[PDB]
Structures are given as structure tokens and as C-alpha cells.
Design a protein around this ligand. Structure first.
Ligand code: 9LH
Ligand code: 9LH
Ligand code: P6L
Ligand code: P6L
Lengths: 381, 381
């Protein structure tokens, strides 16, 4: 555990670096107009956005410096440089999506291009394209070949976006990733005792610095948010997870650590596909008098709604998932449905919750999921 | 020459891609405020900057797609992925310098960090740290060891900045790189016939797409500039050259292709070090009535000037390099010295030249240098 010792020493130095540099560059981002308002707060001040660029940068300098230590053989060297190319490309693309505000078309396609070094490394290092069925005898009728490479391409696209759309409250994005990376770190140390070690000693090389830099980011992103992580971070986070999952051969376990993100993605799916009107910001509404966050709604004319739309809505209404409020004015009759997100579903079930408590609750919900996965995979039921 | 055939097919597709995408993203950059005015033109309209991000992006997608072709052994695979990590990191850092407008401190240090994958690849692939003396028996008294790795670190820092400071006129930055990359391509094809082939088949993999994408950029950057290349491109260009020079083992020949850039850097050195006052923009002044570009000056109080400053200035004045105009008002006595740049020295020698002609003249001057290098290295005097 000597390269891991070096990896931890540089990760702690990376944490110090991230914590120190984020306030040092504040000026540059406010000047560059890379900032947004805390939409769930009465304060109209603009907080610097895209701070994941600073932690992501620190992350790259750390690992570039780390490269000779696990060697001072190329099977793990190709995977190291390759994974760093896919991550660097993603922090780059993420920052450009933050700066240029790209279309949903790019939010999908470009992460597939950035994930190519991982696919190519897997191709040249002859990766096992044959998968093992985790579900019972029902879907079991397999060398997925190109469809396995399609899966690896669509993994980075899911991971980054799933984090990115489960956001809008102080320390949720950096915080959820902090639970996920820690869950992978714990898992790596357990599996570091036997069988697959080369996969977990490798995954730890990327996860220990991702954790300590994200911690340095959360130092300024936690409530009250002084800085915002931005798309740059979601892109970086998603790809680092998708990368270690792919090359470490544990994307299945990793996707189980991603349970709140998966629920949020699917619960959002009718809005994301625009079958039910999707507003630009689906973050909860602040009740200025209460101080706590109340559910956000998407009101629209019921006549304009499609046959599939009113079907999905009425099935979700009955399943006690959405809070539908129908009204009628001089303009006509409307339908004010609940904004389909895990944050608003938590406010639907537990009522209005304060911002600091709501994030903390979601992080605990993330902690519970990791316990469920760790219980499933290690017999603790 | 089959992977080279594939490399050229994708490079032509890359040229088409760059030419098509640059006007498609114009909206995003104007919105993102990533734009500047053509300071040598009367028109106050803002032209989108950082377009090197689009060509640099196209470049990365091409080469990521190219990766399996020269293989479908890891000695050239590590160098390929490694060089792409150093380049991707540089397009990323360059874009952040364009967006955040970093200090001169970062313009130097950060390119050294981005060049680490090249150094590390050279370290692991056991690169020849021992250099051969090109100059005569005078400096010949050598395993430079760490000082050779210092050289490789400072190569990317020189290459990017040297291009970046020899700019400010339509198609100079993209155009000079277009002569340099073509000079390396020609040289690679000559040396592809014998001896070192693995170094030139490798250098061509990066130079053919750099050329065809930069061509696609020059399509919109040539006079009258519709778009601006930005720091993103200078960073990308510099590193791609520094990369192929380092890994291909021909940084010496490459630095001889960089002759106008070297003269411009050293001629600028008293201003860059602030021994003689350095104005923010050292680009020539447009004579609205003439239409042609006239020399730019740096006027200052002669009393405020240091003992070394007035010494360098008077040595350059006598050497017939700077045009010094001394004046005296009620405020006191001033000194209006010529802005120390190869562009203003060309206007000092040839008089006022029109912008389109001036760039074209500098590109021809770049062409002459490549002929001088090719004559030196292949006996054509
Ligand atoms: C539709 C959806 O879910 N869109 C949500 C998503 O939109 C993204 O806002 C950010 C800007 C926010 O960070 C802003 O939120 C504010 N903020 C931030 C942090 C905080 O603590 N407090 C706060 O007030 C701040 O003012 C900041 O500027 C970007 O514009 C980004 O591009 C947006 N990103 C997107 O719009 C992403 C869309 C992806 C569409 C889905 C496509 C499918 C992807 C998966 C495919 C997988 C398959 C292959 C399996 O996130 C929003 C919330 O952070 C939510 O309010 C918003 O509802
Ligand atoms: C001091 C110096 O030479 N500084 C020149 C340098 O400044 C850089 O302007 C750009 C903004 C220009 O692209 C603007 O110029 C306009 N433009 C552009 C293209 C065109 O065709 N027409 C036009 O009008 C447009 O409005 C655009 O916004 C950036 O701000 C960049 O950060 C600047 N970059 C720097 O300031 C870079 C400084 C590096 C300092 C030297 C440090 C030493 C480096 C070498 C060390 C090597 C050793 C290790 C051996 O370049 C300037 C000109 O493009 C010139 O006017 C200016 O004089
Ligand atoms: C499942 C095991 C792995 C996860 C363990 C690792 C732990 C994973 C969780 C990591 C960090 C949670 C920290 C949350 C922030 C936090 O508690 O911040 C404190 C500081 C308190 O701040 P506050 O009172 O909210 O203002
Ligand atoms: C030394 C050999 C290698 C270089 C050869 C490769 C050639 C290197 C030079 C490459 C390109 C020069 C093109 C310059 C632009 C150019 O000529 O643009 C034309 C189109 C004309 O445009 P204009 O009249 O100026 O408006």
C-alpha cells in the first residue's frame, strides 16, 4: 500500500489546494459572469458558478503528479492515462457547457465522444464483453459485443446527467458524489483483501483524490452556498464514476450506489421527454414567511395535454406520486401538477422542509441506499 | 501507409466539421460574451473569440476515433493517449484562460502542469535524456537528466506563448501554425523514407488533423476575420508542436521552424520583463484615412525609466531596431519608443502596410524560415 500512501498524501494536499484556490479565483468568475443567483434564497447577489473547474483542475494536477509512483507493466499505465484523458476531456466539455450553455442534444452526444478513450482502452486491453445476469430466471433466456460498448458509452451520459438533474439545493451535487465516492472507496478497501485487487488499487487511485477535492469544494458549496459546483463538476463526477466502474469492472455495484439518481431520472422521465410540460427550473419554491422549501408546480392548459400525458399523470396521481391541482378561470381550465423530482416527492411525503435539512435528508437517503447495496452484496439482511 | 490513409480521410472530414460548426456555435459565444472587437478596424462590432475551442474539440473527436486504427505494441499507444492528454488538458486550460483572463503567473506555470503527461510518458518509455550539441566547438566543453525534463516542461510554455504574443492581425496565429504544421508534415514525409519512421508516422497522426482543422478555422479567421482563434487555439497549437517535437525526438528542428516566433519573443523581452513600459495591446495603429497599418508606440516619462531601460533602448536605437521620438510638454519630457514586436519592426523597415498584406507578408517570412531550416538540415545552400 505504498502508491496508495503517496496517493493519500497528495489527496490531502489536493484538499488544502481546492479549499484555498476556490476563494482566490472568485474574482475571475464574477468578472467572467460565471455566476448565478441562489434561486431558493431571497438574496439577489450572484454566487460564482462552475467551481468544479477548480477542484477538477486540482484533481488533474494531483493525478498527473501521481502517474510515475504506482510504477516506479503498461496494462495499468494505458488504463491510467486513458481514464485521465476521458476525465480531462469531460471537465473540459463540462466547463464549455457551463460557459456556452449547450443544447440538450450536446448534453447527450458530447459525453459519448469524451468516453471514447475508456472504450478504446477496454478494446486494446481486451475487455470482457460477456456479461453475467444479476436478475432472476425471468430475463435469463451473454457476449453483448458492440452493445456492451454502447452500454459503456451511455454510462458516462447517464452518470453525469443523473447528478446534474438531481440538483438545485446547497451541497446536493457535491454531497451526493461525496457519499458515492466514499461508498466506492469503502467497497474497494473490502475487495482489496482478495480476488480482484488490481481493479480496486486502480479505482482507489482516482476515488481518493476525487473525494478529497470534492470535500474542498463542499467546504464552500455547503449551506449557505458561497460558490456553485456547476455543470463542470457534474460532468467530471459522472465520468470519474463511469470510468472507474468500466475499467474496474464493477459498473453494476456502482449503478446500485446510484439508486436515488436512478429514481430521480425515471420519476423525471415524463417531464424530460416533454409528455407533461417541463419548466426550466424544477427546484422547490421558498416560502419567504416560513423560511422552509415548499413543492414546485407545473401549471398548464389541460386541452393542450396529449392522450399519453393525461394517462401517465392519472396513473402517477393514483399511485400517490404527483399532487394534481385542477383550476378554471376566464382563459379556461388548467392542471397544476407536481414537478416530478425526488426533492419535490420528499416535500410531498414529509411536507415543507428547510433547505439545509432537505439536502442533509437526501444525503442520508443516499447513505441508506449504500447500506442497502452493501447489505445486498455482502449478506447483511 | 494504411493508418495514415485513415488519418487523412478523418482529417478531411474534420476540416468539413470545423468549417461547418464554427458559424453554428457563433450564437453561443456572443451570448457567453466570448468575443472582442477587431481593434485594427473602424467597425465596433464584436467578433466571437475562442473559436480554437471548436477546431480543438473537432481535433480531439477525430484522434479519439483514430486511436484503434494504427493498432488494429503499447510503446506507441502510451505515447498516443499521453500526448492527447497533454493536448486535451491544454485546449481545456487555454479555454479557461480565454474565459477567466488569467494572470501572467498562470500563463507560465499551468502549461508546465499540462505538459506532465508527455514528461511521464517519456520517463516510463525510457527517453534519451542525453542531448547532442548542434552549435560549433565553442559551447562544447551530455546527460542533462532532470534539466532535460525541465527543458520539455518549458517547451510547451514557450511554444504556446510565442504564438500568442505574435498576434493581433487577421489570420496570423492560425496562419503561422498552418506554415509550421505543414513544415513538420513535409519533414515527416521526407524522414518517413528511412531511419526514424516510428517517430514520423506518429508525428503525422497529430499533424495531419491539426493542419486540416486549423485550415477550417482559418476559413473563418482569414481577412476579414469573422471569428477569432483565441488563447484556446495558441495553447492547443503550442502544445501539439511541443508534444510531437518531444515524443518524435525532433524539438531542435521544430524550434528552427519557430524562427519568427523566437525573434518576436526576444525582441519583445525588454517590454515583457517591463524594463521598458509595456502597453496592454502592442498591435499596430490603423490610419483611418490610409486604411493601412502604421507603427504603435509606448510613450512614457524619461525620468521614471531605469538605468538598464535607457541602456537597452539606446543600444536598440543605435542597432536601428527601435524608433525613439523624444518630446517635452508642461508635464515634463517624454520618450515615445516603438512597440518591440516583429509586426512593428516590419512596419519600421517596409513602412505602413495594409492588414491583409502584413499578415500575408509575415506568413511568407515564416515560409522563408522553413526553407532556411530545410536548406540547413538537407544541404540546399
Ligand atoms: C430539466 C432539469 O431537470 N433541469 C434541472 C437542472 O438544470 C440545470 O441547471 C443548471 C443551472 C443551475 O445550476 C442553477 O441553479 C441555481 N442553484 C444551484 C445550486 C444550488 O444549490 N442552488 C441554486 O439555486 C443557480 O442559479 C444555478 O445557476 C444549468 O443551466 C444546467 O445546464 C441545467 N441542466 C439541464 O437542464 C440538464 C438537462 C438534461 C436533460 C435530460 C436528458 C437525458 C439525460 C440522461 C440520458 C441517459 C440514458 C442514455 C440512459 O438543474 C436545476 C438545478 O440545478 C433544476 O432547477 C432544473 O430543473
Ligand atoms: C504582452 C503581449 O505581447 N501581449 C499581446 C497579446 O495579448 C493577448 O491578447 C489577447 C486578446 C487578443 O486576442 C485581442 O486582440 C484582438 N484581435 C485579435 C485577432 C485579430 O486578428 N485582431 C484583433 O484585433 C481582439 O480584440 C482580441 O480580443 C488575450 O487577452 C491574451 O490573454 C493576451 N496574451 C498575453 O498578454 C500574453 C502574455 C504573455 C507574457 C509573456 C510571458 C513569457 C512567456 C514565454 C516564456 C518562455 C520561457 C520559458 C523560455 O496579443 C495581443 C494581440 O493578440 C497584443 O495586442 C498584445 O500586445
Ligand atoms: C456507506 C459508507 C460510506 C460513506 C461514509 C463516508 C461519509 C459520507 C458523507 C460525507 C459527508 C457529510 C457531510 C455533510 C456536511 C456537514 O455535516 O457539515 C458539517 C460541517 C455541519 O454543517 P451544518 O451544521 O450543516 O452547517
Ligand atoms: C515549406 C514547405 C511547407 C509549407 C507548404 C504548405 C503551405 C503553407 C501556407 C498555407 C496557407 C496559406 C493561405 C493563406 C490565405 C490565402 O491565400 O487565402 C486565399 C483564399 C486568398 O484570400 P485573400 O485574397 O487574402 O482574401
Amino acid at each position: 500500500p505504498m502508491p496508495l500512501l503517496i496517493n493519500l498524501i497528495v489527496s490531502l494536499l489536493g484538499f488544502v489546494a481546492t479549499v484555498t484556490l476556490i476563494p482566490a479565483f472568485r474574482g475571475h468568475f464574477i468578472a467572467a459572469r460565471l455566476c448565478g443567483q441562489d434561486l431558493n434564497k431571497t438574496s439577489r447577489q450572484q454566487i460564482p458558478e462552475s467551481q468544479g473547474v477548480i477542484s477538477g483542475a486540482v484533481f488533474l494536477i494531483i493525478l498527473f503528479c501521481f502517474i510515475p509512483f504506482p510504477f516506479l507493466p503498461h496494462h495499468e499505465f494505458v488504463a491510467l492515462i486513458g481514464a485521465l484523458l476521458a476525465i480531462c476531456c469531460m471537465i473540459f466539455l463540462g466547463f464549455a457547457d457551463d460557459v456556452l450553455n449547450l443544447r440538450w442534444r450536446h448534453k447527450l452526444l458530447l459525453p459519448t465522444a469524451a468516453s471514447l478513450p475508456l472504450l478504446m482502452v477496454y478494446f486494446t486491453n481486451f475487455g470482457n464483453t460477456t456479461i453475467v445476469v444479476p436478475k432472476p430466471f425471468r430475463p435469463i433466456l451473454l457476449d453483448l459485443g458492440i452493445l456492451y460498448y454502447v452500454y459503456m458509452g451511455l454510462l458516462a451520459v447517464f452518470c453525469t446527467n443523473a447528478i446534474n438533474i438531481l440538483a438545485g439545493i446547497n451541497g446536493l451535487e457535491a454531497g451526493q458524489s461525496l457519499v458515492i465516492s466514499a461508498s466506492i472507496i469503502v467497497f474497494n478497501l473490502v475487495e482489496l483483501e482478495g480476488d480482484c485487487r488490481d481493479d480496486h488499487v486502480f479505482s482507489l487511485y482516482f476515488m481518493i483524490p476525487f473525494f478529497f477535492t470534492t470535500l474542498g469544494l463542499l467546504y464552500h458549496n455547503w449551506y449557505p452556498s458561497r460558490v456553485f459546483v456547476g455543470d463542470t463538476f457534474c460532468y467530471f463526477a459522472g465520468m470519474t464514476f463511469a470510468g472507474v466502474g468500466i475499467l474496474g469492472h464493477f459498473s453494476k455495484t456502482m449503478l446500485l450506489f446510484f439508486m436515488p439518481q436512478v429514481f430521480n431520472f425515471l420519476y423525471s422521465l415524463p417531464q424530460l421527454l416533454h409528455i407533461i410540460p417541463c419548466p426550466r427550473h424544477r427546484i422547490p419554491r421558498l416560502n419567504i414567511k416560513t423560511g422552509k422549501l415548499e413543492m414546485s408546480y407545473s401549471k398548464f392548459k389541460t386541452k393542450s395535454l396529449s392522450f399519453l400525458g393525461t394517462f401517465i399523470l392519472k396513473v402517477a396521481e393514483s399511485l400517490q406520486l404527483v399532487t394534481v391541482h385542477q383550476s378554471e378561470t376566464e382563459d379556461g381550465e388548467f392542471t397544476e401538477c407536481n414537478n416530478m423530482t425526488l426533492i419535490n416527492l420528499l416535500l410531498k411525503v414529509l411536507g415543507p422542509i428547510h433547505e439545509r435539512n432537505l439536502t442533509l435528508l437526501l444525503l442520508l437517503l443516499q447513505i441508506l441506499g449504500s447500506a442497502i447495496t452493501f447489505s445486498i452484496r455482502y449478506q447483511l439482511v
